[PDB]
Design a protein around this ligand. Sequence first.
Ligand SMILES: Nc1ncnc2c1ncn2[C@@H]1O[C@H](COP(=O)(O)OP(=O)(O)OP(=O)(O)O)[C@@H](O)[C@H]1O
Ligand SMILES: Nc1ncnc2c1ncn2[C@@H]1O[C@H](COP(=O)(O)OP(=O)(O)OP(=O)(O)O)[C@@H](O)[C@H]1O
Ligand SMILES: Nc1ncnc2c1ncn2[C@@H]1O[C@H](COP(=O)(O)OP(=O)(O)O)[C@@H](O)[C@H]1O
Ligand SMILES: [Mg+2]
Ligand SMILES: [Mg+2]
Lengths: 240, 67, 51, 288, 62, 97, 239, 238, 230, 285, 96
Amino acid sequence: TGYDLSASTFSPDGRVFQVEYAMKAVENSSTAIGIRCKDGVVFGVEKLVLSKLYEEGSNKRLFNVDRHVGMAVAGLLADARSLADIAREEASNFRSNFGYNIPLKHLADRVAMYVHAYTLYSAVRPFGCSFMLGSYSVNDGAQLYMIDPSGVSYGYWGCAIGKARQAAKTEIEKLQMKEMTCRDIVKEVAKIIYIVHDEVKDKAFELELSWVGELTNGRHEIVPKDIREEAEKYAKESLK
Amino acid sequence: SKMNLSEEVDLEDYVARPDKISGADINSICQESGMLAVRENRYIVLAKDFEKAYKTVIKKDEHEFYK
Amino acid sequence: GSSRLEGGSGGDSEVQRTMLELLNQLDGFEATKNIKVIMATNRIDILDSAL
Amino acid sequence: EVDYSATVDQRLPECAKLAKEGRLQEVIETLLSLEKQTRTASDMVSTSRILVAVVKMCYEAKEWDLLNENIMLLSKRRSQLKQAVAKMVQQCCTYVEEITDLPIKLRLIDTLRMVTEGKIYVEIERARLTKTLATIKEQNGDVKEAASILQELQVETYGSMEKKERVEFILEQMRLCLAVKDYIRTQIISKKINTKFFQEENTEKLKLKYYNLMIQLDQHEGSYLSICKHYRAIYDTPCIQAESEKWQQALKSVVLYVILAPFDNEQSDLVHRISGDKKLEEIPKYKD
Amino acid sequence: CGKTMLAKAVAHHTTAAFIRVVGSEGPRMVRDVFRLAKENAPAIIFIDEIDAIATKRFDAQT
Amino acid sequence: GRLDRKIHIDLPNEQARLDILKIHAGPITKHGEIDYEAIVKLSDGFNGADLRNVCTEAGMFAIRADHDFVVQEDFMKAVRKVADSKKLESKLDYKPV
Amino acid sequence: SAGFDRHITIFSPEGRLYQVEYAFKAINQGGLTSVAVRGKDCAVIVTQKKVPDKLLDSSTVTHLFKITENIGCVMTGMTADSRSQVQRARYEAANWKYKYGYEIPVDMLCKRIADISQVYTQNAEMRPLGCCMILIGIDEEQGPQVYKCDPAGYYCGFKATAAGVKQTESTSFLEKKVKKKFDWTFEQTVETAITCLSTVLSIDFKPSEIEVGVVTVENPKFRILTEAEIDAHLVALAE
Amino acid sequence: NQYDNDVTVWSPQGRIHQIEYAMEAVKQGSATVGLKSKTHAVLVALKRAQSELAAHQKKILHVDNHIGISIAGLTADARLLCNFMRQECLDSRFVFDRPLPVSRLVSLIGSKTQIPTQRYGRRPYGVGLLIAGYDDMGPHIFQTCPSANYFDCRAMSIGARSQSARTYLERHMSEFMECNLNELVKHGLRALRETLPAEQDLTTKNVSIGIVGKDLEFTIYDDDDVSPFLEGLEERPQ
Amino acid sequence: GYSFSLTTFSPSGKLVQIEYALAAVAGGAPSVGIKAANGVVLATEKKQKSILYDERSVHKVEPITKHIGLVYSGMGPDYRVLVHRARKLAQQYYLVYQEPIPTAQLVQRVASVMQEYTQSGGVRPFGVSLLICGWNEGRPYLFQSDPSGAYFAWKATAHGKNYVNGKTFLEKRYNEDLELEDAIHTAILTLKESFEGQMTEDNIEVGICNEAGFRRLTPTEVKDYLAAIA
Amino acid sequence: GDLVGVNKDSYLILETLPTEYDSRVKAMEVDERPTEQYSDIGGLDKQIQELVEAIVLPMNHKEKFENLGIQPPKGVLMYGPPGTGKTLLARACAAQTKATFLKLAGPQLVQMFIGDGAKLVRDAFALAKEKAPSIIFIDELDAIGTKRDREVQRTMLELLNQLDGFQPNTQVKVIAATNRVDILDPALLRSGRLDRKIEFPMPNEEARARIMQIHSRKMNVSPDVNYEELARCTDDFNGAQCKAVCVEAGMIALRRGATELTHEDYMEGILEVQAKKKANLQYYA
Amino acid sequence: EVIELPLTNPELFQRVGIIPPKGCLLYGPPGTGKTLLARAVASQLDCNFLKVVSSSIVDKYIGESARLIREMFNYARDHQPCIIFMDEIDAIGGRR
Ligand SMILES: Nc1ncnc2c1ncn2[C@@H]1O[C@H](COP(=O)(O)OP(=O)(O)OP(=O)(O)O)[C@@H](O)[C@H]1O
Ligand SMILES: Nc1ncnc2c1ncn2[C@@H]1O[C@H](COP(=O)(O)OP(=O)(O)OP(=O)(O)O)[C@@H](O)[C@H]1O
Ligand SMILES: Nc1ncnc2c1ncn2[C@@H]1O[C@H](COP(=O)(O)OP(=O)(O)O)[C@@H](O)[C@H]1O
Ligand SMILES: [Mg+2]
Ligand SMILES: [Mg+2]
């Protein structure tokens, strides 16, 4: 047990062992992957759904951070909701003060500052969630940043969080993610989500896709997979 | 003296070296050099054995927080 | 004959018990025929008036 | 990690055309370009063949700037796999052995000695190179320096050495230390060899050589008791038991050196054991 | 540095018997080791790193 | 002077787990390719006895299904089952000397 | 032993603040070294960019930062703490420029950061930031300065003493390099830094594996050396 | 337990067992059932009786002309949250004369409940809430829990002995979607009946109803209003 | 013991945490301050862990005012925060009374802040012993303050590592009519006695208060006194 | 280490003797051979098959295992909340497998003297070895299986190494039963020691109905008893509680004097067996 | 290197002068193979191997265990090259 009781006392060995419980908490939640295509970022998140007593789209884990900034989370859902509200507050503050759109790098670093500050005070605890932010500024390119419960903000060409981070990352690694366009990337993401334990032991779940991209006009949208369900057909074809 | 050692063993380098080694560290160095010689099955202890034993051991113990 | 732990993550409860046992033994003047007791204490202030 | 076989596996035959016809400049330029273009992904198969491809044709180019530099320049490069250097030197030692000319082989042995220092993965080649170097000095009367080059030949440290050859070097080592009359280094080197290697079924030649050298050593030192047991070990071999003259002379030496030894308990037991041997009737004048 | 070596060497050269207890090893133990020392008249007691038990006295809490 | 050299045999690593799995699944009569790498990916925190149990439970899935052979699916099921067994293994954190 | 280490604002019986020592055990952060060197006209800092996975964008993985056109910074510690300390330094420098009209000096900046670490050390409200820090800067006609600031709340910014996993070997190598008299040019200084890193790490040192910041009186603008410059230095030292 | 005193400390399990104990505090409350249709959203509560001569405690609360709640947990926290919904509904109507959408209200409730779960020395509100509403986007039934997680649900049941009602609601989920008001309310009554032991059945004493619809304001029904609802419903045979 | 909390008494009436702070004191840097007939001399060592540490980059003797010099016991960062507070306090007195702060009064205010840090249950005192040299109304003053908030006047004293030897030294190696030069010689001599290892211009630094003004010695002057002398 | 009868005065060995383990150890073996059929267990069919394939199949054939090359399981820890069919399943396994069966409880190995417990453990394993086709059943592991007194630890260490280390198996199979698997954690539950961990769940609706039917076969029940409704009302009830429900229904039928019990007797028995529902707590209301 | 080389090849140790380590202890999580490792060492070295569970050495008779272990070490000295293996040593090596 040592001194691993609060995230403000430096435990035996430099590792606090307090936030390394928040990483375990993030490990509990289901997987959530994200891929930066040529013109946009595709957020593919699986949310485990007990079809019993559900609402076919309740408590979805995709949220809007900004008119152009989309996000995905893994871990505690309440912390995700609160920090999505915080990110919306930060984006609105930048929008009102600077008179133009917030760069994704600055938003990501400020949210990471919020997370890191919450990791420190004794009276508060680090968030039990890790998340991944995407945006496209038509002026210069596309931006993506993944932040952990410790507050480490790093970029990824493609990333994953949740219960299958390394498996999903290995699946992403063989994608020709250098050049292709987000349209086929949606199907790639769907089949990658399904290949890693779609419903093998857990009964049922739902797949949600978020999309920011130049062809999507650059704003943040939920991919309307209702059209021909091509990614869903691909994911179920991934059966073998 | 109990050791075997080759002729090329130069203890002066180690006695002059700045690391503040202890007598237990000296015994550890000797035993580790002998084990290095035995590991390569060579019949005698060489200088490079003493070098490898010296660098393999002597944990560098420590700061201005006290000053 | 000292201060006893007044609650927390633990307690002694046995120093006081040995005290009250000795206290009964000398209080009950158990066969006080040619038997006497003597005790020494460093810095009497730490001692208590129970004995 | 990528192993760009397709980029070089067909280009080497192309270089083979220009190589045998004698021009070979395009070949060496091509290979020095390829080395940079494939090694960056740990391409051991490509390197272990391009390196021999350049150095071998530089060997038969009969141009020696082509040989020495195309080894020592590429030996110093970053991120080189140990296998690549090992595969180049196992071919370079052959090119050493096929040059009989003294200066031509001399440049190459110097280059290989320079590039192979301290690197364990080539130690055997360096040793195999070193021996050749010593031989040249012996062919040129330079016994003293070759004594030093076999002194730096510390055979036991090359753990990659095979069983027989590690002993095999020691024979030449003690031979040269005896040549320069360096009895102290002769002794320290000769202490190293283990006698259990003589229980091997195919050690008889090395057995006789080692005993001949140790006999010379202790004979200078006067250790006649040791000489007697050395000659008994020589004598008790099937290769000598079957040839009359050789074991006759071996028994002569045995009896002469047991007689020469100062008296002690061990000497007495040696006399008692020797006197019981039947074959002494072949030399009755010494049995007397 | 040789504290235990030199104590052992002194014990070996002399007729003493060398008992050793490390300070990390309550008062009953101290009385027992002293009694054990008494059993051999020329015996020697050695405590290793006694600082842990011999640190300055103040008002102790627990 | 009594017990000088200490040896720590930690939980088998990824390549160590693959080697142990290959050793244990060697003598079994499988059919077709066996993806040891996916198993090692899933078998986090497993010990050598855990991998032996994985092999055994694959064999028992085969024996129940009345297969004279074993397939990758049996190994998959066995890995999941031994994982649920390790769920019971509420192993307390262990510390060296 | 236990008890004088559960809370920061408690002294040990020997007077030792346990928690400040504890904070030093995360400055290790296996993978970074941060060698700093001063030369007659330059100040160089170099760090070991240990990329753990391929999918990350290498640009974001950087660990050197700048808040002054003539001041460069390199951190060594837990990444979120490092970035928070960098943001605090940026805040302090921005305040200094807005107040005094000119940018904060390197010595004053590191002193302010160390004072922040000190006030978080003395008060139990917050954990001190677990990361060490090095600036390089120029003082007017006075030269290049290299400064170090650590979670101890104190600074000594001196010459080198890389605050990385290879503490003692790197420090001794820098001492030995300066223990023998020699000149100090920009190329020689960067060569000394890279030789230190290579000898203490013994890796092949591919150009993407390290990241270098530098300042020089010839051009006081703190710059991060490009991978082309890094590889040119690597091949220069290799031969 | 070492790591189970407050919400600020994390367990090695990657969990905060204080939040879980808040969940147990919620299930300690009596069962409440919520279900919606395309026409109406209805919730029903099992009012725990205190004695044969004391009022059965109110478990359905009403703050909006179109929104209502049913609680299961400590009455203090539930009624504090009810006053909170009072405040938000009032200033929303004051700001832009708009009956506050239920979804955003539930999101605000979750956000405000999250704050105690991250701060030391403040208990999270150990109640579970079922929210029924009708807005310009549609009918809505939510649940809010002390873990601050909010969910939208067609059918749902929380509290003690809720599993049988949950199974019944799962079975009749295929029905509610086009069910009318009377069918929906009768199915909710039978769902609440599913929770009770064999000897305990639906009666006006322990049953409270709350209904919101596209043509009717949210209203609460009790003894004199529940009595017409219960009569005509199928009795419980053995 | 009663050290984990600062705002409680022990049964014997001791607040153990502050003597723990004093134990941190005298474990730090050795230093000696003496009062001569004319001036006041404070000397402290400069010896770091490695030769890389440019010691001139970190001064230890700090002039609070042109007439005040300050030295500490070894607790670096705490000394820095306290010296910043002392400088600001001296400035406040200098502007409020339009006169320079008295040495004794300056020490009083510094010890008052020290005492202010000796309360509450979530802070700790600066475990620093402070030696203050000053000139006031033509009189030289040497004062010592300690983390408990107490302060005293010393003709000569020392603190840091091996401080008892410095105490004995200033017991027999001192007389109140010492000249300034002989005062610096006594200071460097007790530094030699207390310190371990030789010193040069690099290893010591000294500040001297004279009634005209205070000044910290250049390292060259420090070597002039320490080397080629004594 | 052999048992020999010698001359009572001259001590000359004049007889060899069969090795004697201990009187208690000879008491542990099963001789009565109980009669509980596998059909008598309801709902546990999956767990029954697990135990059978783990224990009986290695006994009967050994060919289907060797033909694969597998090592048959040698340790089965069976567990669940009290009230399931754990001990019943162990009894049925003893009944059907015809093996020389070693039944015992964990406290039996505790004993008083310091070195005894290890000796009983070793001697029981030796007896199992000598009776070769032998089955060892351990009940209440948590009596000795507690994670890290000192002697209980010694006994459980002896059990650990006479079962996993230095040439175990041959033909001895162990079956373990407990209710407190969280107590045992690191020592015994190793995959090498107990290869199978068979969870005995809270009996299912249909499982509960089957349990009541099994226990009520001989009851001469009413021709119309709604077992499904009884199972519905008996949520959280365990198999032992369902048997108690049947017994209580029989008792209530006696108190009515009815020659056959009916459904109403079944609700009365259910009310009897159920808990007290505590009381209404004003905390939450 | 600790148990096989000193036994099979002592001459290195006596000439070089190294005191061979008396013994080595194996610790780790359950099921990591310490006992298996000991079994392999026992099986492959042609020698005299001694293995006993620690729990079994303890006997209820007065001082029987001390004489037991004394006689075990006496047998090991008698039957060199002998190897004694301890499993679950914490049975008797535990803290006082
Ligand atoms: N599935 C079942 N089928 C038939 N009877 C059952 C079943 N489960 C439990 N029982 C009944 O439960 C009673 C007790 O069985 P058993 O001793 O195996 O229980 P247990 O769960 O192991 O209890 P404990 O752990 O307290 O010893 C028996 O009379 C048995 O008839
Ligand atoms: N690295 C490994 N390679 C192959 N098999 C292994 C390995 N580690 C463990 N095993 C297997 O797992 C089981 C562990 O048994 P063993 O008694 O040796 O474990 P242990 O960790 O040494 O435990 P203990 O110290 O309690 O005896 C054996 O059946 C062994 O074959
Ligand atoms: N002066 C010395 N000469 C030789 N060996 C020493 C010396 N000091 C320590 N050792 C080695 O250190 C080991 C333990 O030393 P020890 O007597 O425990 O010292 P201490 O009592 O200071 O810990 C011994 O085995 C010895 O080999
Ligand atoms: Mg039972
Ligand atoms: Mg073992």
